[PDB]
C-alpha cells in the first residue's frame, strides 16, 4: 500500500514514494563509505487528500478539518513508513568492514 | 570528553608518478578510519633511482616511522619535511585532518 | 471473511481481505476513484461509521459483499 | 522528543506541537457526538534542521541532504509521534453510549 | 451497498413552551443514532389544557405512532401537519433527513 | 547505564540515560542543542557520523558545555 510496487508502476499527484538518488560525498558530506559511492533512497512527496492512505484516526480528523478549512497550515504529511537497509563497505584501518546500514531506503510511504 | 579516530588515506606503498611538483595528489581510492583513536595520517615519498613510490597510512605519532619522530604530526596539512636517507631522496609528512594525506605539499 | 477490491494493493491481487467493510469513493477532477478495505476496529462508531458517511465533489459508499467495490 | 510540555511553554518556531482546537460540528462536520462539542487535538508544524528530533537514520540522511541541497523538496517532516485517546459520549437510540476514540490527540512530534 | 441509520433528536416526551409560533427548536441536547436503519425521525407536539408537551424520537415508518401511519416519512423537512384528537390539540410530523425533527414546521 | 544532559526533556529535569554519549553543538543571536544518543544509533561505531558550529559527544555524566 503506497509502496514502490505501486508508485513506480503508476502515476499520480497524491502522496507516494518518489525517486531520489544520493551521492554520499556530495549530498550527505560523508567521506567514510568506500562502497557504494552512492545509492537510491527515494522519498515521500505529495499532498494527503481525505481518505488517501491516512495512517491513524487523527490523520483523518486532520484531513477532514483541512478539507473544511482549505489552506489551514495543518494537515497530514507524506512521510516514510517502511525503511530498508543498505549493504555498504567501509575501511577500518586496512581490513574493510562489510556491514549493513539500517533504515536507509524507503519501501512505502503514508499520510500522517 | 571523547577522542575519535579521524579519516586517512590508507593504500600503503603504491607506484606513483608524482615528481618535480609543488604539490601532488596521493590519489588513494581507500579512505579509512584509523583503528587507534590517537593515530594520525602519514605520507612517505621515496624515489629510488628510476621508480617512485608514495605511502599513505595511519600511524601513532608516539612512534617512529622508518626511524623518524613524527614532529609535524599535529599539523592540519601535510607538508613534506624532507629527511636524509642513503641511495635515494626521502620526504615525509604527517597531519591530523580527515584525508590530509590525500594532498601532499612542498610548495606555496 | 469479506474480500474487497483495493488498488494500492499492487502485488496483492489488487484485492484485500478485511473484517469490516469495503469502500469506494469517486472524486471529480478535470475521474479518480480509489477503493480499499477498512477493518471493523476502524469503524467508528460501528452503528454508523463516519468513514462510510461521505463528506463534501465526492461520492463514497460502503458494501459488505465480495468485490462490491465497483 | 518534542512534546506538549516543551513547546507550549516556549516558542521554538521549529518542528513541534502547535495548538489546535477542533469543533466537531463546524470543523469536521460530525453531528453524532453528543459530548464533547470539540477538543484540543493540536498539530505538528515547523522545519527539521540537521539533528533536531530526527526519528530514524533515513531522517538523518534526508536532513543532511536538504542541507547540502537548498530547496531540494526532500527533507524530514514534522509529524506526530505520540497520539492519545479522547473519551466521547454519543447516543445510539435512547441508550447513552460511552467510548474512547484511539489516536485523536497529539502529545509529541518528530521529524521524519 | 449498505444501509446506515440516521441522526434524530431523541428526548422523548418532554415539557415545552413553543406556542402559537411558526417554528421552534426541540432544543434537546440528545441527538442519537437510530438503532434500526429503517427508522426515521418523528416529532410530536401536544397541548391538552394546562400545559405543553413535546416528544422527539426515532420510529420505523411502517408502524403507526399514536394511530397515525407516517405519511411524510420520506419528506425532507418536518412539516407540522395537524391531527384531530378529543380534548387535546395534536400536531405531528416526520422526515427522512438528519436531525430533521429538531426544527418543527407549523 | 550512563546519564547525560538533555535539552527537550522539560518535565524530566533536563536529563536522560543512555549507553552511548551526550551530544552537543553550537552556532545573529546564538543557540545550541544537547541530547542523548543510544549505542545503536552510533553508526558507524568506530566513528559515528553524528559525532564527527561545533560538535562534542562526551562520555561521562552531565558533561555538556555552553
UniProtKB/Swiss-Prot annotation, chains A, D:
Disulfide bonds: 7-16, 15-78, 44-109, 48-111
Annotated phenotype, changing residue 109 to R: In IBDIMDE; loss of TGFB1-mediated activation of SMAD signaling; mutant TGFB1 is not secreted
Localization annotation: Secreted
Subunit-structure text: Homodimer; disulfide-linked. Interacts with TGF-beta receptors (TGFBR1 and TGFBR2), leading to signal transduction.
Biological role: Multifunctional protein that regulates the growth and differentiation of various cell types and is involved in various processes, such as normal development, immune function, microglia function and responses to neurodegeneration. Activation into mature form follows different steps: following cleavage of the proprotein in the Golgi apparatus, Latency-associated peptide (LAP) and Transforming growth factor beta-1 (TGF-beta-1) chains remain non-covalently linked rendering TGF-beta-1 inactive during storage in extracellular matrix.
Identification of the protein by name: Transforming growth factor beta-1
Complete-protein stretch covered: 279 to 390 of 390
Curated annotation (Swiss-Prot), chain B:
Membrane topology, Extracellular segments: 1-108
Disulfide-bonded cysteines: 8-41, 11-28, 18-24, 34-58, 78-93, 95-100
Localization per Swiss-Prot or TrEMBL: Cell membrane; Membrane raft
Protein modification: Phosphorylated on a Ser/Thr residue in the cytoplasmic domain.
Residues with glycosylation annotation: 27, 51
Similarity comment: Belongs to the protein kinase superfamily. TKL Ser/Thr protein kinase family. TGFB receptor subfamily.
Known partners and oligomeric status: Homodimer. Heterohexamer; TGFB1, TGFB2 and TGFB3 homodimeric ligands assemble a functional receptor composed of two TGFBR1 and TGFBR2 heterodimers to form a ligand-receptor heterohexamer. The respective affinity of TGFRB1 and TGFRB2 for the ligands may modulate the kinetics of assembly of the receptor and may explain the different biological activities of TGFB1, TGFB2 and TGFB3. Component of a complex composed of TSC22D1 (via N-terminus), TGFBR1 and TGFBR2; the interaction between TSC22D1 and TGFBR1 is inhibited by SMAD7 and promoted by TGFB1. Interacts with DAXX. Interacts with DYNLT4.
Protein name: TGF-beta receptor type-2
Species of origin: Homo sapiens (Human)
Lineage start: Eukaryota, Metazoa, Chordata, Craniata, Vertebrata
Part of the full-length chain shown: 44 to 151 of 567
From Swiss-Prot, chain C:
Disulfide bridge map: 4-22, 6-9, 16-37, 52-62, 63-68
Effect of residue 20 to R: In MSSE; hypomorphic variant
Effect the entry attributes to changing residue 9 to Y: In MSSE; hypomorphic variant
Effect of residue 13 to S: In MSSE; hypomorphic variant
Protein's cellular compartments: Cell membrane; Cell junction, Tight junction; Cell surface; Membrane raft
Post-translational modifications: Phosphorylated at basal levels in the absence of ligand. Activated upon phosphorylation by TGFBR2, mainly in the GS domain. Phosphorylation in the GS domain abrogates FKBP1A-binding.
Glycan-linked positions: 13
Residue ranges that the UniProt entry lists as topological domain Extracellular: 2-70
Expression sites (tissue/organ): Found in all tissues examined, most abundant in placenta and least abundant in brain and heart. Expressed in a variety of cancer cell lines.
Family according to the record: Belongs to the protein kinase superfamily. TKL Ser/Thr protein kinase family. TGFB receptor subfamily.
Assembly with partners or alone: Homodimer; in the endoplasmic reticulum but also at the cell membrane. Heterohexamer; TGFB1, TGFB2 and TGFB3 homodimeric ligands assemble a functional receptor composed of two TGFBR1 and TGFBR2 heterodimers to form a ligand-receptor heterohexamer. The respective affinity of TGBRB1 and TGFBR2 for the ligands may modulate the kinetics of assembly of the receptor and may explain the different biological activities of TGFB1, TGFB2 and TGFB3.
Protein name in the entry: TGF-beta receptor type-1
Taxon lineage: Eukaryota, Metazoa, Chordata, Craniata, Vertebrata
Curated annotation (Swiss-Prot), chain F:
Disulphide bridges, residue numbers: 4-22, 6-9, 16-36, 51-57, 58-63
Extracellular topological segments: 2-66
Top-level division of the source organism's lineage: Eukaryota
Cell compartment(s), UniProt: Cell membrane; Cell junction, Tight junction; Cell surface; Membrane raft
Post-translational modification: Phosphorylated at basal levels in the absence of ligand. Activated upon phosphorylation by TGFBR2, mainly in the GS domain. Phosphorylation in the GS domain abrogates FKBP1A-binding.
Glycosites: 13
Tissues of expression: Found in all tissues examined, most abundant in placenta and least abundant in brain and heart. Expressed in a variety of cancer cell lines.
Similarity comment: Belongs to the protein kinase superfamily. TKL Ser/Thr protein kinase family. TGFB receptor subfamily.
Assembly description: Homodimer; in the endoplasmic reticulum but also at the cell membrane. Heterohexamer; TGFB1, TGFB2 and TGFB3 homodimeric ligands assemble a functional receptor composed of two TGFBR1 and TGFBR2 heterodimers to form a ligand-receptor heterohexamer. The respective affinity of TGBRB1 and TGFBR2 for the ligands may modulate the kinetics of assembly of the receptor and may explain the different biological activities of TGFB1, TGFB2 and TGFB3.
Record's protein name: TGF-beta receptor type-1
Organism classification: Eukaryota, Metazoa, Chordata, Craniata, Vertebrata
Gene name in the database record: TGFBR1
